[PDB]
């Protein structure tokens, strides 16, 4: 049974050595997982940063391109709002007072006519005297 004995161990020997190599074979697949991980993290920072940095510069560039005060706030240079209001004040108040003054003098002629009205009866006395003088 010596020939019989040798064969059984060989199956055990073959299976175990292969399985241990299979464990080694499994390990190599596992090592690949560690290998994959390294590239991704570096890229993650890089991908975001690379796009952002150009964008950050470009977004600032776009604003800077238009940071020129294209509207220079000196288009006409008057910058007038209260200009229309101030003129309206002097003319309106003066005209009323002046007219009243004007009216007063105008009215005064009637008042002078009242001084004249005493003279007007006096003038009829002159009219009477001249007719009397005859």
């Amino acid at each position: 049974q010596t020939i019989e004995e040798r064969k059984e161990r060989l199956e055990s020997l073959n299976i175990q050595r292969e399985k241990e190599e299979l464990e080694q074979r499994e390990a190599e697949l596992q090592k690949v997982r560690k290998a994959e991980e390294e590239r991704l993290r570096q890229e993650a920072k890089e991908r975001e940063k690379e796009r952002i940095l150009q964008e950050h510069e470009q977004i600032k560039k776009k604003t800077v391109r238009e940071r020129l005060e294209q509207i220079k706030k000196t288009e006409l240079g008057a910058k007038a709002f209260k200009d229309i209001d101030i003129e309206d004040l002097e003319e309106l108040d003066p005209d009323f007072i002046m007219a009243k003054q004007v009216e007063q003098l105008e009215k005064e002629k009637k008042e002078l006519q009242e001084r004249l009205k005493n003279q007007e009866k006096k003038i009829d006395y002159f009219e009477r005297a001249k007719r009397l003088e005859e």
């Binding site: 005064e108 002629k109 009637k110």
Partner: protein, 588 residues
């Protein structure tokens, strides 16, 4: 004859004997000289039959007594011949039988009584009493079809008196409102009063033009129709008050009629006959024995408006400078001679108080000569303008004046003042107007800086205390501009007699704006009748010159109430009817 006061008989006489003046007197050689010249008196008496020579007690005679073949033909005898051939010193006279103790008839024993007072009461007395304004301007419509005299238009009344054919031809009012004058084929009528009664009428057939003396002694009438009652003439002079004929006068060339110019006070007058002066004293219609008032070789003349001084302008002779003349009215002597060289044309512009005279000198460099007539020795200030002056206007009664110069799109108004310290000043320039005419208010300052503006209202206004534009009238109608005598109305009007874009008269305030218009059918003439100020008391005029404040009473509400009462309800009865009428406007 020989006598230094030789005249014939003073009346027509008996019919049976002929009188011959400058006759065939007794004495050798003197007799045959008027043998024919007295056969003038006796030639139309038939054949002269006897012409006995009377001698005045042996002195040389001028007259003889004559008889004819027919005694009663002496009335014929003195008209069909005069001036038959004569020698020595006798010619051209005839009459009838040496009549004497001649007589004349004339109005006497003056008592004014009737017709003295309708004219006077209406204006310058009632006017002063009247408290409204606009100068109580008269009205003329449809070439005299309706003629109206009116009261003040600011108040409810317009029309004071209106009549048909009151003025058949044109219109005229006197300078102080006392009289209104009318023209007609039969003569002139003076009208006056609130009811515009007939004041005086001068019967004068076919009178073509008239004028009135400043002191009302004389009426001046001008006609293209000639009458023969007075010497060969085309002009009658009438006494305006009495209707009496004062004088008649010839006119050689009727170019313009300011022929009898008057003194400032109206006391004396001057008149040109061609290049000769005839002087009629305005008070007496008498000749002035003042030497200058018969002057030879003067060429233009006018009077001071406040000083009675005479002025003459004589254009420059070949070698002697042109010279302006100041002749005083009675003394007749020179107070100032103005000799200037290269003068081209001259116009005389006086100030209303007669304090200053401006001479517009053309040299073209126009020069103004301003004479300080009140300051002693009459120093003359010369204003050298440079740009073709087309108008001058004095401030009435003041020492300021206004001028207009230049091209019509760029016409400049310049206001000037003359000062007590001699130096003249331009107060303000108002450029680029269309003005060519000035109608100042009688009260000062309110100078109407406006052109003709006929159908194209380009009128403007300058006040002169502050050189300020008070108000503008855009009235196309305005062609003439005048201020009221009171100084409270300036009327801008149009004439359908003259043009046809408007036909109306507008009655406005002298402030500077047209208020409203009363239309006139043909607008022959529309004028404010004068309410001219005759006098004033300086003390009453001084300070307030009111009863309290502003004008008269401090309230000054006596007339002011009417605006609010009449508008809501004019008389209550009129109201309820007519209140609906413009309630409708808003609501509907």
């Amino acid at each position: 004859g020989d006598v230094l006061k030789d005249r014939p008989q003073e009346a027509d006489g008996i019919d049976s004997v002929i009188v011959v003046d400058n006759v065939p007197q007794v004495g050798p050689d003197r007799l045959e000289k008027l043998k024919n010249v007295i056969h003038k008196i006796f030639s139309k008496f038939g054949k002269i039959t006897n012409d006995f020579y009377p001698e005045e007690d042996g002195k040389t005679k001028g007259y003889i007594f004559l008889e004819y073949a027919s005694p009663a033909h002496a009335v014929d005898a003195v008209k069909n011949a005069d001036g038959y051939k004569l020698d020595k010193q006798h010619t051209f006279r005839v009459n009838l039988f040496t009549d004497f103790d001649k007589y004349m008839t004339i109005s006497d024993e003056w008592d004014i009584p009737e017709k003295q007072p309708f004219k006077d009461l209406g204006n310058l007395r009632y006017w002063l009493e009247e408290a409204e304004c606009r100068d109580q301007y008269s009205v003329i419509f449809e070439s005299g079809d309706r003629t109206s005299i009116f009261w003040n238009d600011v108040k409810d009344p317009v029309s004071i008196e209106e009549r048909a054919r009151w003025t058949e031809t044109y219109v005229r009012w006197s300078p102080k409102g006392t009289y209104l004058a009318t023209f007609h084929q039969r003569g002139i009528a003076l009208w006056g009063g609130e009811k515009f009664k007939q004041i005086q009428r001068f019967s004068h057939q076919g009178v073509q033009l008239i004028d009135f003396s400043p002191c009302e002694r004389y009426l001046v009438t001008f006609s293209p129709l000639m009458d023969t009652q007075d010497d060969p003439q085309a002009i009658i002079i009438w006494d305006i008050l009495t209707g009496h004929k004062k004088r008649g006068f010839h006119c050689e060339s009727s170019a313009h009629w300011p022929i009898f110019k008057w003194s400032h006070d109206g006391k004396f007058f001057a008149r040109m006959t061609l290049d000769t002066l005839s002087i009629y004293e305005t008070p007496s219609m008498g000749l002035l024995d003042k030497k200058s008032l018969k002057i030879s070789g003067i060429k233009d003349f006018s009077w001071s408006p406040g000083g009675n001084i005479i002025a003459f302008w004589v254009p420059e002779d070949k070698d002697i400078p042109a010279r302006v003349t100041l002749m005083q009215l009675p003394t007749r002597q020179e107070i100032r001679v103005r000799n200037l060289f290269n003068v081209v044309d001259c116009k005389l512009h006086w100030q209303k108080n007669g304090d200053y005279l401006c001479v517009k000198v053309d040299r073209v460099v126009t020069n103004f000569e301003i004479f300080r007539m009140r300051e002693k020795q009459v120093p003359v200030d010369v204003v050298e303008m440079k740009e073709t002056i087309i108008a001058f206007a004095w401030e009435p009664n003041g020492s300021k004046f206004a001028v207009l110069h230049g091209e019509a799109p760029r016409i400049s108004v310049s206001f000037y003042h003359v000062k007590n310290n001699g130096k003249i000043e331009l107060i303000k320039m108002f450029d680029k107007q269309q003005a060519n005419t000035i109608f100042w208010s009688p009260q000062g300052q309110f100078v109407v800086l406006a052109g003709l503006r006929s159908m194209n209202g380009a009128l403007a206004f300058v006040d002169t205390s502050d050189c300020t534009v008070m108000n503008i009238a855009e009235h196309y109608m305005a062609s003439d501009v005048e201020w009221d005598p009171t100084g409270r109305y300036v009327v801008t009007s149009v004439s359908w007699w003259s043009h046809k874009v408007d036909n109306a008269y507008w009655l406005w305030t002298f402030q500077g704006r047209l208020l409203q218009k009363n239309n006139k059918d043909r607008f022959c003439q529309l004028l404010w009748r004068p309410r001219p100020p005759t006098l004033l008391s300086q003390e009453q005029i001084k300070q307030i010159k009111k009863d309290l404040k502003k004008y008269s009473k401090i309230f000054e509400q006596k007339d002011r109430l009417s605006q609010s009462k009449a508008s809501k309800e004019l008389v209550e009865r009129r109201r309820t009817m007519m209140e609906d009428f413009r309630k409708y406007r808003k609501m509907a």
